[PDB]
Amino acid sequence: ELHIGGIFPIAGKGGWQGGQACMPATRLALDDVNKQPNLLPGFKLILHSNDSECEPGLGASVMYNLLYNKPQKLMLLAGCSTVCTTVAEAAKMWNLIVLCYGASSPALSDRKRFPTLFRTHPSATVHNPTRIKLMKKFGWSRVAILQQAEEVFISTVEDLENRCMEAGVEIVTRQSFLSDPTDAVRNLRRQDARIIVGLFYVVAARRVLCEMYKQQLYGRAHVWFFIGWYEDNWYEVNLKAEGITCTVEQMRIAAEGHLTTEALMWNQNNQTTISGMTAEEFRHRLNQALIEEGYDINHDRYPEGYQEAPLAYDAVWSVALAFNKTMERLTTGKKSLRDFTYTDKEIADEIYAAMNSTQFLGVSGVVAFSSQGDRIALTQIEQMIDGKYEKLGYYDTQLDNLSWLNTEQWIGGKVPQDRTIVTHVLRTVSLPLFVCMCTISSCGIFVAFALIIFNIWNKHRRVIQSSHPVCNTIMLFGVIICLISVILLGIDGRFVSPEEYPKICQARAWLLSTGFTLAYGAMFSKVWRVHRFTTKAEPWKLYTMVSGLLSIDLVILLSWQIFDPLQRYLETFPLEDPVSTTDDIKIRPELEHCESQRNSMWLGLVYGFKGLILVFGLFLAYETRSIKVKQINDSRYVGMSIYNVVVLCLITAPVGMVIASQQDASFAFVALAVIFCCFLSMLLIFVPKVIEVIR
Amino acid sequence: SDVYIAGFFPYGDGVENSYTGRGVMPSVKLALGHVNEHGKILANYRLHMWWNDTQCNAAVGVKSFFDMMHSGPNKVMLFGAACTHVTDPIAKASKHWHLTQLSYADTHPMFTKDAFPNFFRVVPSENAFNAPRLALLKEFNWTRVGTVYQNEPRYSLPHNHMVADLDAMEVEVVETQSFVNDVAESLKKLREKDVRIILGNFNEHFARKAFCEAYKLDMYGRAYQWLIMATYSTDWWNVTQDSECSVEEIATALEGAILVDLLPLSTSGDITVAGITADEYLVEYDRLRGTEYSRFHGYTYDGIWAAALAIQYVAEKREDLLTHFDYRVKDWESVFLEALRNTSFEGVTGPVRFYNNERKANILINQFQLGQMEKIGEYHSQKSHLDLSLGKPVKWVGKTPPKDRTLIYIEHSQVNPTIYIVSASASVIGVIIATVFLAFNIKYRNQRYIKMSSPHLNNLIIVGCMITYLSIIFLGLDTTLSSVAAFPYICTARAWILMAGFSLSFGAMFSKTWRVHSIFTQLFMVVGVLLAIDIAIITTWQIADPFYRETKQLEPLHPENEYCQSEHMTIFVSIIYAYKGLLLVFGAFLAWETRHVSIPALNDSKHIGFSVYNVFITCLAGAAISLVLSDRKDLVFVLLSFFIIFCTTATLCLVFVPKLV
Numbered sequence A: 001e002l003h004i005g006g007i008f009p010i011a012g013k014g015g016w017q018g019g020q021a022c023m024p025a026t027r028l029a030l031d032d033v034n035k036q037p038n039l040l041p042g043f044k045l046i047l048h049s050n051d052s053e054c055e056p057g058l059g060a061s062v063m064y065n066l067l068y069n070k071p072q073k074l075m076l077l078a079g080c081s082t083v084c085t086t087v088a089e090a091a092k093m094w095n096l097i098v099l100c101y102g103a104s105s106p107a108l109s110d111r112k113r114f115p116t117l118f119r120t121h122p123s124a125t126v127h128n129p130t131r132i133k134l135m136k137k138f139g140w141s142r143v144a145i146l147q148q149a150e151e152v153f154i155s156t157v158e159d160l161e162n163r164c165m166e167a168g169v170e171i172v173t174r175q176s177f178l179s180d181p182t183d184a185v186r187n188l189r190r191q192d193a194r195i196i197v198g199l200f201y202v203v204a205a206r207r208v209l210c211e212m213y214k215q216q217l218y219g220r221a222h223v224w225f226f227i228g229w230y231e232d233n234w235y236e237v238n239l240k241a242e243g244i245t246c247t248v249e250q251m252r253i254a255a256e257g258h259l260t261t262e263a264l265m266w267n268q269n270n271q272t273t274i275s276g277m278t279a280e281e282f283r284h285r286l287n288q289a290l291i292e293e294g295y296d297i298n299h300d301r302y303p304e305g306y307q308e309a310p311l312a313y314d315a316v317w318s319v320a321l322a323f324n325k326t327m328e329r330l331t332t333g334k335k336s337l338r339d340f341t342y343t344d345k346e347i348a349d350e351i352y353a354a355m356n357s358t359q360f361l362g363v364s365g366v367v368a369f370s371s372q373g374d375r376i377a378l379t380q381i382e383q384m385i386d387g388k389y390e391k392l393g394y395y396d397t398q399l400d401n402l403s404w405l406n407t408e409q410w411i412g413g414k415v416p417q418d419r420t421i422v423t424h425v426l427r428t429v430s431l432p433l434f435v436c437m438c439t440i441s442s443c444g445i446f447v448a449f450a451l452i453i454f455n456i457w458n459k460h461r462r463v464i465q466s467s468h469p470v471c472n473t474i475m476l477f478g479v480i481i482c483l484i485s486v487i488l489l490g491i492d493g494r495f496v497s498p499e500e501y502p503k504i505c506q507a508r509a510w511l512l513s514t515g516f517t518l519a520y521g522a523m524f525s526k527v528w529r530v531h532r533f534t535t536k537a538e539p540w541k542l543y544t545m546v547s548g549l550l551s552i553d554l555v556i557l558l559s560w561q562i563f564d565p566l567q568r569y570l571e572t573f574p575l576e577d578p579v580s581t582t583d584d585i586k587i588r589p590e591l592e593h594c595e596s597q598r599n600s601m602w603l604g605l606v607y608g609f610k611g612l613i614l615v616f617g618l619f620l621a622y623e624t625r626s627i628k629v630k631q632i633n634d635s636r637y638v639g640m641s642i643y644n645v646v647v648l649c650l651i652t653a654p655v656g657m658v659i660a661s662q663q664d665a666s667f668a669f670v671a672l673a674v675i676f677c678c679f680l681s682m683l684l685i686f687v688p689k690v691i692e693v694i695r
Numbered sequence B: 001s002d003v004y005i006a007g008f009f010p011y012g013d014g015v016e017n018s019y020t021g022r023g024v025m026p027s028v029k030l031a032l033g034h035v036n037e038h039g040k041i042l043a044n045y046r047l048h049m050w051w052n053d054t055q056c057n058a059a060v061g062v063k064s065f066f067d068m069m070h071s072g073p074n075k076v077m078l079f080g081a082a083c084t085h086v087t088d089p090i091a092k093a094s095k096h097w098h099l100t101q102l103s104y105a106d107t108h109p110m111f112t113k114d115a116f117p118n119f120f121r122v123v124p125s126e127n128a129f130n131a132p133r134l135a136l137l138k139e140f141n142w143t144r145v146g147t148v149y150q151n152e153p154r155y156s157l158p159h160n161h162m163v164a165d166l167d168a169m170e171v172e173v174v175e176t177q178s179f180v181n182d183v184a185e186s187l188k189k190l191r192e193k194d195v196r197i198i199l200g201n202f203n204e205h206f207a208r209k210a211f212c213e214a215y216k217l218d219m220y221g222r223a224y225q226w227l228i229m230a231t232y233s234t235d236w237w238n239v240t241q242d243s244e245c246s247v248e249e250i251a252t253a254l255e256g257a258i259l260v261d262l263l264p265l266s267t268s269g270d271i272t273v274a275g276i277t278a279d280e281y282l283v284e285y286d287r288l289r290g291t292e293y294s295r296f297h298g299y300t301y302d303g304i305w306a307a308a309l310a311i312q313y314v315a316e317k318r319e320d321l322l323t324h325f326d327y328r329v330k331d332w333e334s335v336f337l338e339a340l341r342n343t344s345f346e347g348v349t350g351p352v353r354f355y356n357n358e359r360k361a362n363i364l365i366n367q368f369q370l371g372q373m374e375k376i377g378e379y380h381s382q383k384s385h386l387d388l389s390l391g392k393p394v395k396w397v398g399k400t401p402p403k404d405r406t407l408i409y410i411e412h413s414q415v416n417p418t419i420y421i422v423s424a425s426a427s428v429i430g431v432i433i434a435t436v437f438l439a440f441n442i443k444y445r446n447q448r449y450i451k452m453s454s455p456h457l458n459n460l461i462i463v464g465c466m467i468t469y470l471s472i473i474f475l476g477l478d479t480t481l482s483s484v485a486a487f488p489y490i491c492t493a494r495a496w497i498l499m500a501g502f503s504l505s506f507g508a509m510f511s512k513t514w515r516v517h518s519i520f521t522q523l524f525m526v527v528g529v530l531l532a533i534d535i536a537i538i539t540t541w542q543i544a545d546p547f548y549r550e551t552k553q554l555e556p557l558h559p560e561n562e563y564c565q566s567e568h569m570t571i572f573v574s575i576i577y578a579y580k581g582l583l584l585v586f587g588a589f590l591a592w593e594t595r596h597v598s599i600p601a602l603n604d605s606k607h608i609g610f611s612v613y614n615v616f617i618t619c620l621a622g623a624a625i626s627l628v629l630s631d632r633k634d635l636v637f638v639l640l641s642f643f644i645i646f647c648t649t650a651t652l653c654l655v656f657v658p659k660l661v
Ligand SMILES: C[C@H](NC[C@H](O)CP(=O)(O)CC1CCCCC1)c1ccc(Cl)c(Cl)c1
Pocket: A015, A016, A018, A079, A080, A081, A082, A102, A103, A104, A105, A121, A201, A229
């Protein structure tokens, strides 16, 4: 006649008075252990029990009374986590195994403090792998935590964080309140979080729910991982008693589409358990037995600890199975379970070995214990739709088996993302604008080369013979290079890979500077030669100055290219709202501005050189109003053109920097102005020559 | 005539915290012998301590407690365990036996009255270390303290009470660091702010690690002051366990640190309830203790005496102590509770008297000086008083306590009369020379001077030369010599007069150069025309862009610039400089072109060219140093005033009338 000890929190105040339903259930199991089957061949398993009232002092008193009285006990059963810690941590001294049917505290998972503790109740950190699997199943990586800091949620949140660091999930916030989450859920939509896991009790859960309508934290852009073991209608009860300013309608409205992950305490299948009945049959029998105790559960008002009755039933059945295996192994000799004392280490170790290797289908499912005494449970996932919970699936934590019933109803038909994904788009010059500018530049190159070919008459006719043809050839060759630079100025990153874009960026500046220098070695230096000839009153004195200007600006450009080039300075802009997509994609523009380290220094140096030459040429042409010379006969035209070229170059560079952030207009002006600067300065010089040469 | 008490000790062999059990048992025997050998304290009674060895285990302690409850003589009180995780289960379990528990060595800051009504503490908790440290912050003026504490609860609630208590005393927390295993990161975070006084809550190993890092990163001393609780072992810094820092290395960072610890015995000459002073009891304990020692020996002696007092009170009130003692009967506990609330007696550790449930005991305060831990003083908690004169004097690194907030003063710059007075004297001599040359030009209409360059333009260039000196004096003036409200005007005087100096000096040469230019192949108004190009734009300075000085205090090592307007300068000043440079390069180029042209009726053109060349080079250098080397106004002035005066003197000497015999 084996005896066991049980501690059941029945008649207490506060805490978890779960014995009210967990005491009768064990009794039922007791019958099903000893009355019907041959589970104990010649033994009747008895249970001595007393109330603990969910406090550790009375639990210790009950344990002392049980362990220091005449009927010898072989095992201790305990309820809440406080009593479970009080008994299990002190149980090794008496060589007793403590099986707890309602201890969900994660702090009980350390075998060092509790060497003989088994819990048929799943630990509070059993949903965390399921939450992480759900996060990795919908592609979410940015999640937030809303704690309550009750010394039990801290451990669960720590476990969740440590498991997240092994899954790549990034946690944005760890907001934790104590009684009022107003200043804890408000900051949730500051580090804007869409996926939020709630780690609070039902009393705080209702208040958190009420504190996410006026903050508008619900809808299509947010998903809540609530705790799954609340009451089914946990949002429409205890309203007036609490300071819930919200209403039942809005209570339900934002409960839509939140996922709850729970530890399974009832067998979801219809299979017959080892007890000889199914989960529904045991539920009906427990309902029949509980009404005798003084409960009116026919019209609801369920007793406390109702959901954990299968845990107590399976705890008793696990005790019986372990004892049966213990006597089966102990028959190889003379020692028996009846002759057990608190100083008998071998029998206690054998019972521990038997309770380690337990694997049976009970009312709560496949009951087995992990290496640290925790209950190996199959997690269950459900979602609230229109104020009702629909089961999305189940998850096996030990081996990755996510049995999914595709019944998740995401609003909008698509899984919400964990953030507002930003896409960077490169703003480019308009294709028709670039094509038109390229065609105009090609026409300019064609006409320039046409004049270069037409310069064949240099010896044939005196009009070009006495016009210093080498200077005109230099001018045209500079015009061609500068027009090519204009073409290269429209080639943005849309047309070239970014890894080679700096090559085009550097080539643009090099070609533009070289072209301008060659176009003012003939538009200004010829005027300088005219002025000097007039004052002092032939070909080396012009080409040498051209070569000197080319030498200095080539040195400047080479130093710019080698010492400090430009790569990319893609700018930004306000986060634009894109076309109708009904989704959170934020499109941000980026330009392709060039910028070197000391871009101001290089640009100022080059622009000062150009401006000095421009002002020199303008003033020389001012002094070159009417000093017409025989051998430089086109001294009045190539001066007439200096005025317009100077005004164009003094009107383009200033406003160009102002509009440089506008991709289209800046390119359009810097192209059209150069087109004119190369068109009038070409016509004024060469069309009179063509008119005079043939007539 | 035999009253029993139940005791729990960490005894026997190698168990953790065993020294606290084997070092207090001699004191327990001493107190039992003194109580039994004493009259008028308890008669027809004999206090017997039934004690069990709780091997630092929460299970062994509970089993021993249940064993002494189930069998043996009725124990009337519990002598609490010296380990928190051992006494906490006993404290929770004994509440249903209606027993009063008295602790002798447990300092954990969680055994409050609300959670443990029957747990009285002769030894004060760690919270009792808050008051002395915060007292020192009042003794030496430190109103800015940083806090680093171990995340364990034993070093968490005392820190919370401290940061909630120093708030009322106008002391501001700068930072709060709570490490777990790495203290170096906490120290780096603390140094991120400029905090010098640190309050630390950690165990001896973590104290060694913290000072290891406080050497690794420089917090050794003479500027950083430490204030930590030090209920550690003797010579804890001498144990080699930190990050490779030797004993001769962990001590350097420990120098000048103030440590608060539990006072083992009262240093006053008061006579205890045993009839012997604390020194006689110390002699007896040292004689009967052998090699084992613990700081709680006086505390457990006083605990046994308090238990005897409580039993005497219970006997006086309830006569049926030994014939009606029932665990299940509640009122007994209440009586003992009252007996433990009327306890007020002088013991070997001071006035024992329970206030809420704990005891206010004197706090020893010592300081690491010259490679040794020397006592500094005592903080009496009954009458809160920081007696700092009892021990050795407080030895500071240097002569002054470390400052809570680093102080570096900053007062302007640009000064040293000399740099300015010599420049003012040079400008006075320069304007004297300019006036002398003007007088020498006044004797016009005499041969060559009549036929030379226009003497009117000479008076204009001389006026320019003098106004350049006026410009350098006006520009050099600072805000320490004049009213600060006059800063814009002088800034305007910095600009306008300077723009005048270029107009009336460079323009005079420019007019002659333009004449020579018009010659190679009614007139001085060009200078005025040039004046226009500046005066109008200077008005656009005042009308829409009021001057606002920018005070930038940069690298104030063991000074702030007072520059001009904080307005558009790269748009405005750049334009002025570009226009001046255009004029300079124009003049230089025409002078180069007009080199050897004699062209009478306007003489000394070559000297005008030389003057324009030196003006070009000096102005280029001055602009470069002004736009680049703008570190402080003193250096700018000492670099530019000499150049300005040299160039101006060259201009007024080369062209005026050099010798002309
Ligand atoms: C699922 C969980 N099982 C009970 C748990 O094992 C008992 P426990 O582990 O002792 C935690 C208690 C703490 C005090 C208040 C009740 C919870 C449960 C069931 C119902 C409620 Cl109302 C709660 Cl808060 C927790």
